[PDB]
C-alpha cells in the first residue's frame, strides 16, 4: 500500500510549533529514495541512518511530527541541541531521532503584516523531556511577592507569535519541518521499502 507521505508533506497547513501534531504510519511501503532525491528539501539531515540506505531498511512503525519554524531555529531541531525551541517547544531526544526534513515555505506560511497563526513557547518552568508536548497556556506569574498574584498579566504571557513577513528575509523565513522516528526490536516489522 502506498504511504500517506504526500498528505504529510502537502498538508496545506502545519500545526504550530508548541502544539506539534503527530500521525502514526503503518503497513506502508516507504519510497524514501524518490522523496529524498527531490530538490525542494533544503535539508535532509539524518542520524543513526543514511538516506540512500532508507529503502534497504524496514522498521516496525514510524511517527512523523510536523511544525513550522524559522530558519535559525531549524538548526536547533537536531539531537543534542539546546535553545528556546529545543528546550521549551520540542525537545528532540539525546539519542537516535531519524531524519529531519525542512523546506522554506515562505510563500505559504508568510503573510503581509505577519502571520499570527504560529506561536512558540517563550519560557517554561523546566525544559521539556524528549517528545514531550504540552498545551498548558497559563500566565507565568506564580503570584507571591516577586510578581502579581496568579491570574494576573504583569508577568507577560507564555506564548508569542512569529509574525512572518516577506520583509523578514532569508534569515527569518518560516520553514516547514517534519521529523520521523524509527524504533526496532520491540515488534516484528510492518513497513518496508519497495
Amino acid at each position, epitope marked *: 500500500n502506498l504511504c500517506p507521505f504526500g498528505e504529510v508533506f502537502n498538508a496545506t497547513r502545519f500545526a504550530s510549533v508548541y502544539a506539534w501534531n503527530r500521525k502514526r504510519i503503518s503497513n506502508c511501503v516507504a519510497d524514501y529514495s524518490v522523496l529524498y532525491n527531490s530538490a525542494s528539501f533544503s535539508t535532509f539531515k539524518c542520524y543513526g541512518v543514511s538516506p540512500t540506505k532508507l529503502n534497504d531498511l524496514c522498521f516496525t512503525n514510524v511517527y512523523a511530527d510536523s511544525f513550522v519554524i524559522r530558519g535559525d531555529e531549524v538548526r536547533q531541531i537536531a539531537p543534542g541541541q539546546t535553545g528556546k525551541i529545543a528546550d521549551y517547544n520540542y525537545k528532540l531526544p539525546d539519542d537516535f531521532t531519524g531524519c529531519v526534513i525542512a523546506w522554506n515555505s515562505n510563500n505559504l506560511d508568510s*503573510k503581509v*503584516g*505577519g502571520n499570527y497563526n504560529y506561536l512558540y513557547r517563550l519560557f517554561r518552568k523546566s525544559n521539556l523531556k524528549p517528545f514531550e508536548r504540552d498545551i498548558s497556556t497559563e500566565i507565568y506569574q506564580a503570584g507571591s511577592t516577586p510578581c502579581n498574584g496568579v491570574e494576573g498579566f504583569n508577568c507577560y504571557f507564555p506564548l508569542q507569535s512569529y509574525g512572518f513577513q*516577506p520583509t523578514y*528575509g532569508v534569515g527569518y523565513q518560516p520553514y516547514r519541518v517534519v521529523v520521523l522516528s524509527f524504533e526496532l526490536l520491540h515488534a516484528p516489522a510492518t513497513v518496508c521499502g519497495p
Partner: antibody
Amino acid sequence: QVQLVESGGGVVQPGRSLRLSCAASGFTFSNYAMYWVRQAPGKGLEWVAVISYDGSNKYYADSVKGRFTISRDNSKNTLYLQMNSLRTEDTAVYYCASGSDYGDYLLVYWGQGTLVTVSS
Amino acid sequence: QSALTQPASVSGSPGQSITISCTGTSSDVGGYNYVSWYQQHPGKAPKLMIYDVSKRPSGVSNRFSGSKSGNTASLTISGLQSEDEADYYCNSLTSISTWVFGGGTKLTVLG
C-alpha cells in the same frame, strides 16, 4: 474557479468621498490578502492600497496615504475601499486583487476594475 | 515613488527571441528576489507571468523565462506568436513594506 467583481465606481465631482466594493468567491478570502491597484487610462499600473488577512494591518501609497481607507469583512468574502478628498489625479481604473498559494505578496487574482473620474 | 524603469517598447519578428528589462534600487529589486511580471492585453484585467526566482504559474506556456542581476531583472520571451504584444509590467516589493510598478513595456510583433 476564482472570481472577483468590483462595484460602485463612477462619475463624481472633485473633493467628494466615494466607496468601492470588491466581492470574491471560490477561495478562502479570509486566509490571504486583498490589494487595490489603479491604472490611469493611457498609463501604466501603480499600487494604491493593501490589507492583511486579519485586517489588522494596512498600507497605502504616499499619494493616497491617510486620504483613503481600506477595510474588509472576512465574514462576507467582501472587500471595501473608502476614498476621501478625491482629486483630478484619482481619475483612474481601480482593480482589486488577492494573494494566493503562490505568494501572499503576489497579485495572483484580479477583478475587472471600475472607472472613477472627478469632474466639476 | 521609486517607479521602476523599463523600455517604452520592444519589437521582434514571429518566432524570434526578445528580452524586456526592469531596473530599480538596491532595495527595490536588489536584495529581495520577489520580482514578478504582469501581462495585460487591452481592455481586460492584467495577468501575471513570472514571480520569485523566475518561477512560472501553472497554466502558462514555458516560453517565458526571467532573470535577475542585482539592480536589474529581465523577462525573455521566445517563439513570438503575435498574441504576446500585450504590454508587460514588472513588480517588486520594497523595504518599508511598499510595492512598485514599472513604467510598462509595449511589445510589437511584425506579424
